[PDB]
Amino acid sequence: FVLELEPEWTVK
Amino acid sequence: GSHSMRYFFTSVSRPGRGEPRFIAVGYVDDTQFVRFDSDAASQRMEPRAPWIEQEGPEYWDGETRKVKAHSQTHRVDLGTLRGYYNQSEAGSHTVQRMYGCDVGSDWRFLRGYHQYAYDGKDYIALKEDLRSWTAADMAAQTTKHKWEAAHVAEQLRAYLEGTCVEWLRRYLENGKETLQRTDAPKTHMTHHAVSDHEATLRCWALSFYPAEITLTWQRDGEDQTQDTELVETRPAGDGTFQKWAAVVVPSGQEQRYTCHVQHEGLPKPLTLRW
């Protein structure tokens, strides 16, 4: 079951 | 013994044309159970173990949605990171992400992790407490500040301590037949005479699961690393693993040497002798 990666969690 | 669920994500930029190559793989312990490959035709998270196939369309839709979102985050990051390091728009670069959770023999949370790398080097990683970050350079330090302001660690911790463990437990039960089975190493010794005065003894461990194993040589009951070779543990391709260790010995003195095999599937460690 994969993480719900929120859109703001980019590196920049 | 302990169990783990781990996901591995690799994105490789293709700046001549198109989106990055994106490959995602999910493991329970040393068993791959899902995959996504951007070059494959389905554009779906795909099953790679029989025990995950029973999951319904809601599961597969969800996993596909999330893994695609991962790919787009990596796509954005590849673009911005190229800019920070002042790298050319022609060259290929890599983002890698790994995260997951370990549970103990009681199937309860032991530890969590979330690590990120650019071009094969550490970038940012969640610390063991799941409340703080290790940033390798100043780009990653700026990322730390951003992610601390956005409370990323708290939300990752919720997943790693909760969601990750719950689904790991589901998979362990559903895949009991294979995931909870230990395959003890099938062991034997071979002998090769390189000359009249020198011989190599090779101690084999085959068809074992999980991959964790220790193979050691002794001479007259004490450990020997001198004149030994130990290969990396390798996949057999049927879900099991292989390893060997060799020792070079004087011809005629083979009986002095013993190979010792430690593995979860062995109640007591095994001793082999020529």
Place this chain on the structure above:
Amino acid sequence: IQRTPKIQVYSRHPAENGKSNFLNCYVSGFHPSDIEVDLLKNGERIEKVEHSDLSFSKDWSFYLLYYTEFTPTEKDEYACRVNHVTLSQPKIVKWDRDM
């Protein structure tokens, strides 16, 4: 970074001449992920070779298993040929029954 691939060429099961088996080439410890791996029978490239999905170790280095069904014999020679940015020329590792 650049890391050169480690290579192991081996059979899935103990080898017996004239009996079907699987030939493995395990490539590991490399970066970047772009790599060319071929399995050879008497120097000629074997077709329809499959491989695992790209994954990596704690140190970020990649690993892949390439594999195919094969029947060893006394006469036939099997090998794995690997090309990578770190290598000046293709690295060929011959299969041996004792490794």
